[PDB]
Each structure stands twice: as C-alpha cells, then as structure tokens.
Design an enzyme around this catalytic site. Structure first.
Site, PDB file in Angstrom:
ATOM      1  CG  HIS A  19      21.262  19.055 -99.023  1.00 44.43           C
ATOM      2  ND1 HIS A  19      20.403  18.624 -98.034  1.00 44.43           N
ATOM      3  CD2 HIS A  19      21.743  17.975 -99.685  1.00 44.43           C
ATOM      4  CE1 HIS A  19      20.338  17.302 -98.157  1.00 44.43           C
ATOM      5  NE2 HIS A  19      21.129  16.864 -99.131  1.00 44.43           N
ATOM      6  N   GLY A  59      22.415   9.987-101.479  1.00 42.11           N
ATOM      7  CA  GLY A  59      21.424   9.941-102.544  1.00 42.11           C
ATOM      8  C   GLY A  59      20.010   9.697-102.038  1.00 42.11           C
ATOM      9  CB  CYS A  71      18.974  13.807 -99.409  1.00 44.97           C
ATOM     10  SG  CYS A  71      20.436  13.470 -98.404  1.00 44.97           S
TER      11      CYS A  71
HETATM   12  C1  LIG Z   1      25.700  10.486 -96.728  1.00 44.49           C
HETATM   13  C2  LIG Z   1      24.260  10.374 -96.297  1.00 44.49           C
HETATM   14  C3  LIG Z   1      23.761   9.176 -95.797  1.00 44.49           C
HETATM   15  C4  LIG Z   1      22.461   9.117 -95.338  1.00 44.49           C
HETATM   16  N1  LIG Z   1      21.626  10.163 -95.345  1.00 44.49           N
HETATM   17  C5  LIG Z   1      22.090  11.317 -95.832  1.00 44.49           C
HETATM   18  C6  LIG Z   1      23.386  11.477 -96.326  1.00 44.49           C
HETATM   19  N2  LIG Z   1      23.852  12.712 -96.834  1.00 44.49           N
HETATM   20  C7  LIG Z   1      24.226  13.777 -96.094  1.00 44.49           C
HETATM   21  O1  LIG Z   1      24.129  13.816 -94.873  1.00 44.49           O
HETATM   22  C8  LIG Z   1      24.808  14.939 -96.898  1.00 44.49           C
HETATM   23  C9  LIG Z   1      26.293  14.669 -97.205  1.00 44.49           C
HETATM   24  C10 LIG Z   1      27.134  14.951 -95.987  1.00 44.49           C
HETATM   25  O2  LIG Z   1      26.986  16.312 -95.526  1.00 44.49           O
HETATM   26  C11 LIG Z   1      25.693  16.760 -95.385  1.00 44.49           C
HETATM   27  C12 LIG Z   1      25.514  17.820 -94.508  1.00 44.49           C
HETATM   28  C13 LIG Z   1      24.247  18.343 -94.320  1.00 44.49           C
HETATM   29  C14 LIG Z   1      23.191  17.825 -95.039  1.00 44.49           C
HETATM   30 CL1  LIG Z   1      21.620  18.554 -94.887  1.00 44.49          CL
HETATM   31  C15 LIG Z   1      23.358  16.775 -95.920  1.00 44.49           C
HETATM   32  C16 LIG Z   1      24.619  16.207 -96.089  1.00 44.49           C
END
Ligand SMILES: Cc1ccncc1NC(=O)[C@@H]1CCOc2ccc(Cl)cc21
Ligand SMILES: Cc1ccncc1NC(=O)[C@@H]1CCOc2ccc(Cl)cc21
Lengths: 304, 304
Positions: free
Chosen positions: A41, A143, A145
């Site tokens: 992503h 961030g 990720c």
């Molecule tokens: C905000 C955050 C906090 C902690 N760990 C991860 C995140 N980030 C996420 O989840 C991001 C932003 C939101 O939408 C999605 C949807 C799918 C996927 Cl794979 C990623 C994301």
C-alpha cells in the site's frame, strides 16, 4: 530472579530499516541483501485505500518512483515486484548490515518482538503474541507500516511479521515476509471482522511455571485435574483447549519445578473460577498469555 | 493506537557490550571510547562477597588479569581504576561502535530500558522504572551484572544504570555509571533493607491519559478533586503525594485530551477506592506506574 515481558535485542533489525516513499506515501521497508520489502500500500494515496486495484496502481509506477533511504544512503532501485501484499524492491547495493536471517510464518499463540519504526527510524521495541485470531495487540500509529516482527536464535533473525493495518477496533494486522496476511484480512479500508479470540492456555501455564520459579506460589493448591475436566473450564472461560502437544511443550518447566502439568492446570482452573482475589502474579493482576513455554525456559536460563 | 511497555531500540548499546573476566568471575562490561566500565565485584570470588575490602582485592590485580572480550576481539588493558563501585579499564582501542552518549543519574520514578546481557552477549531488552525506593524490578540472573539501563534522545544514549545485585527479596540494585549506588545499597552479600516503596502517582496519571487517548475511558467520571483531597487518598493507598510540578509535567496530556489534571486525579481516586471491578485498562488489571508523562507523549506521537 524477576520475570519481564522481554523483547529480543533489536540491533540486527535496526540495521535493516529503511524509509520507502512512493508519491505522497512514506512508510518503512526492510533491506535484506539487495532487496527492500515493504507493504504494497506504499503505492496508494489515502483515497486509493477504499478499494485499491494494486495491480493497476503498481503499473503506473516505475523503479525511480520508489525512493528508498537509510539516513544518508539513498538506494538505487533496479527492479520492483509485488508478491501478495508486499513489494520487493531490488536495489543495486546489498545491505552491509544484513544479519543471518530467515523468513518464517509463525503460528497463532507464538510470540515475537516488534521494532516499531516511523520514516525508516526505530522508535521502540516490544514483545507481543500473535493472537489465536491472527491479530496483534501492538502499538502502532500512521507511518509505522512496514515495521517488522521477529525472533532471534543465536545469530539468526527469523522475520515473521510486517505491519500493515489497524482495524477499526484498534487491533493490528499484517503479513508474513512473503506478503501473506495472517488471518482473513485484506489490505483495504473496509471494516473487517477479526473473529473470536481466545486466551493462549499453554502460555498462561508457562507463565504460572515462571511465577513458581520466581517465588510467586500463592496460587498453588492441593488439587489436580484431567485434560477433559480442565477443557470444560477452558471452554467456559474462552481459553484454547489444552492438548497433549501443549502438555509435552510444558515438559521442561514441569521437570524443573517438579509440578505436574495437570496439577498446574488445577491451579489455573481455580484461578479461572475464583479470580485473583485482589492478589498479583509476577506483577500482573490478570492471567498473562504472552509468554510461550520456550520464552519462559529462555528467560529463566539467560540464553543469549 | 495501542499502548505497550516499549523499550528503546537497543542496537547502540549492543555494540558497547563486552565480557570482562577476572580470575574465576565473569560479568558484562560497557565499552565506550577507550574505557570499559564494569561492576567492581568482578575482582571477587563468591567467598570474598561476604565482606569485601575492594581496595585490597584490587591491589592484587594487574592490567593483564582483566580479560576483556567482544566476540573475536580481545581488548588490551592498559590501565585500571576503581571509581566508587565500578572499575574503569582503560583499553588501547576506542570502541568503533561508540554512540554519542552521556552518563546521567536518573531520578526515582523515571523509566529506562535495560539490555540484559550474559557473558558479554545481549539476551533481551525491557522497560522498567527506578522505584521510589531506588530498587528496580528487573529480570536478572547470575552473570547479568554489568548489564546497563539507558534512555535515548535522537542519536544520544544516556546511560543511567549498571546492574550489580539481587537483594534477598528478589528485587534489583545497581549504580549510575560513576559507580554510585542508587539507594542505600552496598556491594556485599548481606541482607539489606530496600525501604518502603510507593506507587508513582504522576506515572499512573500519565498512563490513565494514555488509556483515554487509546479508547479506554470507562474509568472517567463526573467528579473532580483537589491536590489536598487527592493526597489524603494517595497517603491511604501508599501513592507518592502529587505536587504542582507533577501537574505541570502532565500539562501536555491534559491539553491533548481536554481532561483537567485534577479531574483525572478524581478518576484515579475512584479507582483507588473501588478497584477495577473486574475490568482492565490498556490490557492491565492494576494501575500501571512504569510510564512517565514523557513516555506517554513519545509513544502517542511516534518519536524516533
Ligand atoms: C493509521 C494506522 C495506525 C496503525 N497502524 C497502521 C495504520 N495505517 C493504516 O491502517 C492505513 C491507513 C488507514 O487505512 C488503511 C487500510 C488498509 C491498510 Cl493495509 C492500511 C491502512
Ligand atoms: C545472583 C544474581 C542475580 C541477579 N542479579 C545479580 C546477581 N548476582 C549477585 O547479586 C551477586 C552474587 C550474590 O552476592 C552478591 C552480593 C553483592 C553483589 Cl554487588 C553481587 C552479588
């Protein structure tokens, strides 16, 4: 003496962390040999996340669109490919800090250390378990990720997790290093059921052995139980059914303490049925399930 | 989202760990620049520990009696001196992995990461607090002496603790990097009173703010209190009296959440007086005091 939620020393993993940017999105990547692994992503904008067609989105990107940086080192990208939910960016330089490593898919109930990172920089390390429902209860913000989970055996780092997502419930989801999600999760911004979780019975029993080893013994009783009787109690309290394989993995702890596994099960049964009565075990007021029997043996013997 | 007992990434400290042997005793040393720091009891045998005259014991040792090793690197000792309860072994080679560092004496109630080591090798990392009574509740076995505690601000490691001893009660005692014990402890095998400990009130309040930030809010109430009223409750429950300096340090968390510090004190007062009623806050069934307000701000903002 003393028993702590100990994480593996993170140094070998810190030397692998890089920042990966693609367009407006920046996240963490893992640089091993001449490949950088990161959540696919990284190619999405926030709008794209509602229902991304990753194949189409990746077709609009070229090697030069993936900016890979490790402080003052800018990496030259010479290839890109998507494997499940991860991107593998081939770089022209092998990471000189690459440790001996393996990619492993851990089982639910197993534990690992997470090196939380932001913008390619390590912020902290913590130990956690992969829940039976394949989620992790981590500490991650936007961030983080691309931050990874791992275990270390002597000089070898076994990478088991890469962070991808936070569910609407606040729990976390990610993949193995081949980009396969643990659990039913998909990498899109949609509400997704994690499913019923359970307490990791074998880990609670391992932690009760750790308690006895370190002097917390008030919960020991004059009772015993059977696997069948204990499992009726486990069922009632949403604990994983105990199997002979679990009893077998507790063998070393039973041998060291002289407390039969089913005798420890009777203590766990009484704690489930009566609670802690305002007391604590190893500084906890609840039954801890984030220590595997292997974790207890390692910590109680000072393995490096 | 999510809140974990997070330790600092240990890599910068792992690169400083060495094994120090003197006679029959082996423990950990910290190699910074051209000096190796280690507990002075490395010069003792188990018999010597009952009442050691360190000055006399050290007089029988020469530079060549201190074997310093970092894996395949044997260090050449060109000087030795005792500073309080630490030995400083001057070596002919500056550690190429020396990070930017400082030696600091932390205050009781402050937190730090411990890199537990055995035979100069890192085994794990965990976060802990220096208790108000100057002990730490760590996880240490024989051979872990010389393992250090530290904090990291950007690229600088502030070393605050070196492990020396386990009290007969199972709690731990050690020194700053100038070899001064935290607390009344002496480095000899004698039963030693740690003294009355208390709960770190400002840290519990910081952790309650972390809970509200991450969605655990059931403990919030319609009440308020004063510093005087709250301190009568703190007294009853063996909590540290809250001061305006503590309120001041909680300012950022109060500003972020919009919950006045004394309103959060009223929630803490009700939890002290009524307990958790079988509920949890951030996965804990007790009031956690190992997170400082600075730790909460850092974790909740993803500082690297
Ligand atoms: C905000 C955050 C906090 C902690 N760990 C991860 C995140 N980030 C996420 O989840 C991001 C932003 C939101 O939408 C999605 C949807 C799918 C996927 Cl794979 C990623 C994301
Ligand atoms: C056994 C152990 C476990 C954890 N941490 C530390 C230890 N080790 C100790 O305490 C050793 C052995 C016992 O006697 C003494 C007395 C004074 C001092 Cl400074 C050191 C020691």
């Amino acid at each position: 003496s003393g028993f702590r939620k100990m994480a593996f020393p993170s140094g070998k993993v810190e030397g692998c962390m890089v920042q990966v940017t693609c367009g407006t999105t920046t996240l963490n990547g893992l640089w091993l040999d001449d490949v950088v692994y990161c959540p696919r992503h990284v190619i999405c904008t926030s709008e794209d996340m509602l229902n991304p067609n990753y194949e189409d989105l990746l077709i609009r990107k070229s090697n030069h669109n993936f900016l890979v940086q490790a402080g003052n080192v800018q990496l030259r990208v010479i290839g890109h490919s998507m494997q499940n939910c991860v991107l593998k960016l081939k770089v022209d330089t092998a990471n000189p800090k690459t440790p001996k490593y393996k990619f492993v898919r851990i089982q639910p109930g197993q534990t690992f250390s997470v090196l939380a990172c932001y913008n390619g920089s390590p912020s902290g390390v913590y130990q956690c378990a992969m829940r039976p429902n394949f989620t992790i209860k981590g500490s991650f913000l936007n961030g983080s990720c691309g931050s990874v989970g791992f275990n270390i055996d002597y000089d070898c780092v076994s990478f088991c997790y890469m962070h991808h997502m936070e569910l609407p419930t606040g729990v976390h989801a990610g993949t193995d290093l081949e980009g396969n999600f643990y659990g039913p999760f998909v990498d899109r911004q949609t509400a997704q059921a994690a499913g019923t979780d359970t307490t990791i019975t074998v880990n609670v029993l391992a932690w009760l052995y750790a308690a006895v080893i370190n002097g917390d013994r008030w919960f020991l009783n004059r009772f015993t139980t059977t696997l069948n009787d204990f499992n009726l109690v486990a069922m009632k309290y949403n604990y994983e059914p105990l199997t002979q394989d679990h009893v077998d993995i507790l063998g070393p702890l039973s041998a060291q303490t002289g407390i039969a596994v089913l005798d420890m099960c009777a203590s766990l049964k009484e704690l489930l049925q009566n609670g802690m009565n305002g007391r604590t075990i190893l500084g906890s007021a609840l039954l801890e399930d984030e220590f595997t029997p292997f974790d207890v043996v390692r910590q109680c013997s000072g393995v490096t």
